[PDB]
Amino acid sequence: QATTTRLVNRIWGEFYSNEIKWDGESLGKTSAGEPLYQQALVGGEMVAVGGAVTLEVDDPDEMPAIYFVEYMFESTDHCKMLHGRFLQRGSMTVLGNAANERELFLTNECMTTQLKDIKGVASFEIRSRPWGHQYRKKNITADKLDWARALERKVKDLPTEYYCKSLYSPERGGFFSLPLSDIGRSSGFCTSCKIREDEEKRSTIKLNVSKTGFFINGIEYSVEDFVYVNPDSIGLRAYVVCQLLEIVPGSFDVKVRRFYRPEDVSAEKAYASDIQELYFSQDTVVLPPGALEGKCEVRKKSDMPLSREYPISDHIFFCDLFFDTSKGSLKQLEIRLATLDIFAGCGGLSHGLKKAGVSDAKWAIEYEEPAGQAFKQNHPESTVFVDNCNVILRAIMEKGGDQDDCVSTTEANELAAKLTEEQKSTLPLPGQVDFINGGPPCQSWSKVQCEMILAFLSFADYFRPRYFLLENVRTFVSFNKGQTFQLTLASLLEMGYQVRFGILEAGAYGVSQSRKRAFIWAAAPEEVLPEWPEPMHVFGVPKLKISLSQGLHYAAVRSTALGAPFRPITVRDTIGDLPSVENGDSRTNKEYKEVAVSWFQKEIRGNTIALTDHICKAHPEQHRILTVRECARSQGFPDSYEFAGNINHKHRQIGNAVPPPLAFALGRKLKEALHLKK
Ligand SMILES: Nc1ncnc2c1ncn2[C@@H]1O[C@H](CSCC[C@H](N)C(=O)O)[C@@H](O)[C@H]1O
Ligand SMILES: [Zn+2]
Numbered sequence: 001q002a003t004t005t006r007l008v009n010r011i012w013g014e015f016y017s018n019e020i021k022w023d024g025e026s027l028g029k030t031s032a033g034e035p036l037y038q039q040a041l042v043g044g045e046m047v048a049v050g051g052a053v054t055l056e057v058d059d060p061d062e063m064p065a066i067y068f069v070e071y072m073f074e075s076t077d078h079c080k081m082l083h084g085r086f087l088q089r090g091s092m093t094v095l096g097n098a099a100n101e102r103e104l105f106l107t108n109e110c111m112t113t114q115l116k117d118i119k120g121v122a123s124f125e126i127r128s129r130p131w132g133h134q135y136r137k138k139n140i141t142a143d144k145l146d147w148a149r150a151l152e153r154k155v156k157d158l159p160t161e162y163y164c165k166s167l168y169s170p171e172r173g174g175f176f177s178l179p180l181s182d183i184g185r186s187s188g189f190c191t192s193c194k195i196r197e198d199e200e201k202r203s204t205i206k207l208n209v210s211k212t213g214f215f216i217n218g219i220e221y222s223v224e225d226f227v228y229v230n231p232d233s234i235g236l237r238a239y240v241v242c243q244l245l246e247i248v249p250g251s252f253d254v255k256v257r258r259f260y261r262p263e264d265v266s267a268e269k270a271y272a273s274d275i276q277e278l279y280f281s282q283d284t285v286v287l288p289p290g291a292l293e294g295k296c297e298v299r300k301k302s303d304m305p306l307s308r309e310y311p312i313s314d315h316i317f318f319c320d321l322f323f324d325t326s327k328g329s330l331k332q333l334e335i336r337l338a339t340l341d342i343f344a345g346c347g348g349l350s351h352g353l354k355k356a357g358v359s360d361a362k363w364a365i366e367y368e369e370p371a372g373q374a375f376k377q378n379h380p381e382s383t384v385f386v387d388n389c390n391v392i393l394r395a396i397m398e399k400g401g402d403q404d405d406c407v408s409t410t411e412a413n414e415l416a417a418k419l420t421e422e423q424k425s426t427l428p429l430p431g432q433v434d435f436i437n438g439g440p441p442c443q444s445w446s447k448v449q450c451e452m453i454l455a456f457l458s459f460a461d462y463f464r465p466r467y468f469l470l471e472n473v474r475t476f477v478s479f480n481k482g483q484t485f486q487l488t489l490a491s492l493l494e495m496g497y498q499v500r501f502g503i504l505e506a507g508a509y510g511v512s513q514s515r516k517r518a519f520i521w522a523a524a525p526e527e528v529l530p531e532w533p534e535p536m537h538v539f540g541v542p543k544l545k546i547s548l549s550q551g552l553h554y555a556a557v558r559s560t561a562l563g564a565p566f567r568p569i570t571v572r573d574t575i576g577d578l579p580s581v582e583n584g585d586s587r588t589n590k591e592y593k594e595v596a597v598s599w600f601q602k603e604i605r606g607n608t609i610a611l612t613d614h615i616c617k618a619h620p621e622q623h624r625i626l627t628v629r630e631c632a633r634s635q636g637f638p639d640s641y642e643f644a645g646n647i648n649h650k651h652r653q654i655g656n657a658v659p660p661p662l663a664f665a666l667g668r669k670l671k672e673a674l675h676l677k678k
Helices: 006-016 136-155 191-201 267-271 348-356 369-378 389-399 410-416 421-425 455-463 479-495 599-605 628-634 647-655 660-675
Strands: 020-023 035-037 039-042 045-048 052-055 066-074 080-089 103-114 118-122 124-126 162-169 174-177 213-216 219-222 226-229 240-248 253-260 279-287 292-296 337-341 359-366 383-386 435-438 467-473 498-505 516-523 545-547 553-555
Touching (some): 045 066, 103 191, 337 348, 348 435, 389 455, 435 455, 455 479
Parallel strands (some): 359 383
Antiparallel strands (some): 240 253
């Protein structure tokens, strides 16, 4: 019941069916003076820079490993050394059983060994297909050829042939573009080895002889600077902000001053105060240099960026007053991309992306009328298509003259035949979309090929956008024993993408409700993959762990339970300002009763004066359930947002949306990635 292209259907169905010498002269010498060579002959086989060799290791049942050579040289001992980077097999990576048999992945670990211990030379090549939708058809033809010859080698029992496409980084959990310009140089300077030695050099305390500054965790810590200190170190809260006063005689300790946050005095004091408020103190304490977690900046109330964004992304505080703990009271002293939001919903994600300045929703797809109406009301310029995705994809396939490249049922064709001329003419075309985002719903192969999934994959395959965003609930990496996640990664890699995945928590970005969302980024090989945003608010949630292969694990972002630069947001900061109502109220347009007091209410009330959607069905103090506007505030929806349909449709839109601050942070990261362009 799902219209999918040939490639995705084929992949999913295939998965679900079940004497030593040198050559030439030396080219130069290494740093130590050892002459390096280029070509060698051993046992009738030829070894050259850029090839792949096999080594001998224990467990003879496992077939020998593959090493991509980097450089070979001759030492004064008169031996023959060769240095090679490991080529990880696809079956041992996160993909698992769904990985390609002939696929290898580059790694960052390299080792040197004697040449006499190699088993032999294996064929190896690197493929760099041009990127674009127009070449797409041609590509599959080549793939068909790749299906034949190798199969012939299976019949003739010839040795297999491998290839490499992308570099695997389990520490970042991503497949990235091969650094071609920094590989295969044959100069004795391995980039991975230099990176590893630089990393090993760091993470060690540097005892600077100058009594002005030092180095910690690869950062420079100077005198008269503001630092963060873990409250547990000081004999859930935020980072204790201090000022580095002096260093006294793993050999020096730091004596620092102190600042007191408004939440320390009383809850009510912070309930009516800013988020960058601090109090001076005369308390000085001595700590080891390993208790510092970052750098802050405390400024005056005379020069500010005047960009009061939400959520806050820069570490900056201010303090113009004094304090005294003894008394107990404080005293005075060109890049926007056209996008298509499949499964648009109420439009929260699209609103956040557009607010971030990287997206403008020129198209959308919706299943239910009220959600499409809400999207149209909030996004007037978005051409919302209120219909099922199968018929819409079939229509664009027919318009593009590729009706033979889609597995569509009769119902999809007959429903697509009823579209008018205007609807057909307003459809997009390949080459006009540079961004595709949306989260498909989630819920022997014949019963799984009708799932709402693979529709997004077919859309991405047909359009081939520059960037690709996918999102689901936190259990997307555990559905069907994780098979669907592996298959999605395999399909995205087969298309020729750089992909990455990560679990994010919405409770550490300015939202009072905890929510875990799994995101997958994909990009073209010529573009830079965006980085994950950094949390700034504390929340009682452990590290976000994704189960990889070989027992390894990867975390998208650092934990925030230990501390964060900003205090958490509670319930009173969200719904403590709206006027009270009675049970079963059914009035839409009201007026505000009280002025904004808390920081969150001040930020979210904006300039509007007309309260809307304060409707509840038939709360710690009132004997009634939360209203629609209360839920919208709890999810970070600004009051200016508009809805549609009845109350049940509004609640369903609320419960299936994405917090706008999270989308804003992701869009800011994407904007940074776009600006950081080669
Ligand atoms: N076949 C289909 N085509 C389009 N939308 C569909 C669909 N099946 C379900 N939907 C809708 O897709 C939504 C799933 S949740 C998606 C929310 C959206 N990403 C947002 O940011 O708000 C629901 O509104 C659901 O009704
Ligand atoms: Zn090296």
